[model samples]
Target: ATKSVLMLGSGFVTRPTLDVLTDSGIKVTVACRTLESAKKLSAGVQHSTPISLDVNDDAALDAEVAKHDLVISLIPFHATVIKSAIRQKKHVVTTSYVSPAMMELDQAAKDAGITVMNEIGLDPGIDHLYAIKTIEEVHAAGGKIKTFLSYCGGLPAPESSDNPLGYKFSWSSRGVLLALRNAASFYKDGKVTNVAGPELMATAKPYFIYPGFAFVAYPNRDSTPYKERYQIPEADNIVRGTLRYQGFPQFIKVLVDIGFLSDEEQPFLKEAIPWKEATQKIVKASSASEQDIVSTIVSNATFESTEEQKRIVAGLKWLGIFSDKKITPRGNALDTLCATLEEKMQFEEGERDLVMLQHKFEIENKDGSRETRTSSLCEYGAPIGSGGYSAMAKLVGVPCAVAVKFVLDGTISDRGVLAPMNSKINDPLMKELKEKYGIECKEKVVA
Candidate 1:
């Protein structure tokens, strides 16, 4: 009998995941809000079905959940769907980080003899898998970790980085913008370092000396917990961060200082206000000229009078922050900024995006010798009009599909809420990723 899976949401990451599943001869039903999107994703694929599904409609969603052996939710707020699956005694997989609500169901899922796997996507997924692999290898060889740092980013391929921002959106613009508002904590030099949301960009520093380019790394959400999660209790330095091209931090810091990324609501103005005027109101600028506004921001932020500040101002100008165009009446400054970014910073047809991940580990061996090992994964997106996969989508989606295969085949029999951290699960999945999908990491060691 062919195994069947229910997959929710057919967004940017859906196609590659569906392709992997359907090609492997698994019966998949892709449920999405629009039948058109589902149809497009499932078209010409054998043993695949497309159905219009609104996840919010409990009766309909529950009915579909009961029909499938397992559920893969790519939708936001996966807890609701996972709850339904747990009730039906069905297994589940997701790409999101495990939330407290999801964690609360661990015992329920175990008692029901079902597995709920979360954080199996690119960062939380691949990063966790590889980091665990490295940590295990060191421990097995009788080595102790001294420092651990991991950085990942989705960026425009070098050839396509023509824009001043050095980035193009391959995922949700709102999501990228909202991440700037996150406070970060990480371990450094035997002490815990905390960075407030406003200081996130300002505190970012360059890391990982790649051949042609160096990326700026800023602490991601609280990394201190991961010491226990990764089982590295003795490490003196542990940091996980997001990476971006040079000058990204400077540009974003200016925007942060000027309140462009604020979620606070501004005074309701008439619909006819130009973007420049709207920005002026937010910054309380004395004049409405674009140059004046930029000067005011630079002066207020105490940005040094240098070429870098000028370049940052230029990037902001290119984003239309100073344009005479009328604001479209978004709810807040962040929303308005996201809308502008989405419109302006988009990948052109045939252009490709890149996903880069690097993990650096400093360890002391049993022989009292210290060594550094750097493991990296760099992948490029497929051309836009050529049926190519975006690096972001493939890295996130393919592993998710492979995890489902792991569950169905009894290779992963742990009946509880889980993540892809165990070797029993990650070993085979990593193997499949390299052999079947040609996605692998490169490791270099230095003594």
Candidate 2:
């Protein structure tokens, strides 16, 4: 039987997924809230069909799932539709981080012999695969795991700098802002310490990864959840940080301090006013010019005011914030801001850059000696079409694709909710992705 795949949402990220599926000769179908968008997505794709779907409608979702051999959800993380997918026993794949409700369905999934995979997006997705490869290497080299840190970001290409904020919205502005404000907890020196918003800046350091070094990074979101996920020993030191080009965090500090990042403040502002204009207004109100804003923020940090600093500012503006010109997209202010940012951060048609993952391990050698092993995995998309299959997209999409394919192929024989990293299915799961999907992870060790 020809395998059939159904996608829940059609958007820029989904475009590459559809292309890969069609290229693999799988029958593909796109279902979206708007029939027009679905038709537009399916137009040139061979053997693809479109369906109008409101995922909130349980009956509609269940009906939709029954018709496909595999179900892939790119829907927003919400409870309703997620439940429907599990109940229908359709093998599922998604890029959203796992939610409590979805986790609750693990037992049901196991009983039904269905595989439900989540957190298959950029950070959680690619990072998990890279970490696994590192863990295997660390074990083989007779090193006991000590510390693990994984940080990744979607940044503007160094040359196309335009935004005053020194950053562009590659994904979600609210997510970025919220991530900064939340306190970070990580295992270190045999204890878990919590670092609060912006204050974590004090401990921020320079990070060197595969292709090159990220300018700087700060502790992001709650890292407590990941301690057990990464299986760090109680006595081991570990930290997972978020990386950005230098000027990025300093610029973000200004926005966070002035209350654009606070839920009590910004949500009210965002609800009452437009996002881009509102940010412009906030910037104007601060008595700082674009360059002044960038410089002022950096004055308090370790970075310098230099050519790279200026370029970061330009990157922010290209996303449409620094420009005085206005866009008239009629939708939620936040949504428009997010939409504009993705366009600006996207790679040009056919530009492929590398995805870099480096893991440093502190080990206890077999000879009662201490040693360190650092493994780096760097992969680049082929230069055929926007490398649209970016390090970001591939890291994000490939894991989900791999997990979904495993479920359909019955290699992921256990049902219930599972993350790609910890599930028993991951052994074969990783093999399939590396062998069949061209997402192999490479390793290197430096003393």
lDDT by candidate, in order shown:
0.84, 0.64
* Cα shift from native, residue 96, model 1 (Å): 1.6
Model 1: lDDT of residue 399: 89
Candidate 2 lDDT, tens digit per residue, 1-447?
679988887664676677767776788889998999899878988978998888877888889888887788876644565577667767788887777888887787777767787777656676676676666665666666766666655555444433444354545665765566578887777678899866876567666664444457666665667667766553266766776665565666544543334333333243434334555554444532555554544453343457655554555555555455454342444444545555655455554544555556666766767666665555665443633465556666666666666667777666667676654655675676677766655565555
In angstroms, give how far residue 408 of model 1 lies from its true place.
Answer: 1.3
Clashing pairs in 1: none
> In model 2, which range of ten residues has the least summed lDDT?
263-272
Candidate 1 yields a Cα-based lDDT of: 0.84
Model 1 C-alpha lDDT per residue in residues 1-447, reported as the tens digit of each score:
699999998788888888889888899998889999889888998889999988887777788989999999998857788788877889999999888899999999998889998888899899888899999999999899889999999899888886666779866777887777878888898789888675788777777557776678888887998888898987989999888887777666777778877888766543657888888777778877986787787778855467877777787778777889877677688777777788888988989988999899999999999999988999889988878899999999998998988898887788888888679878988899889888877889976
Q: Which of the numbered candidates is closest to the native, going by highest TM-score?
A: 1
lDDT of 2 at 4: 92
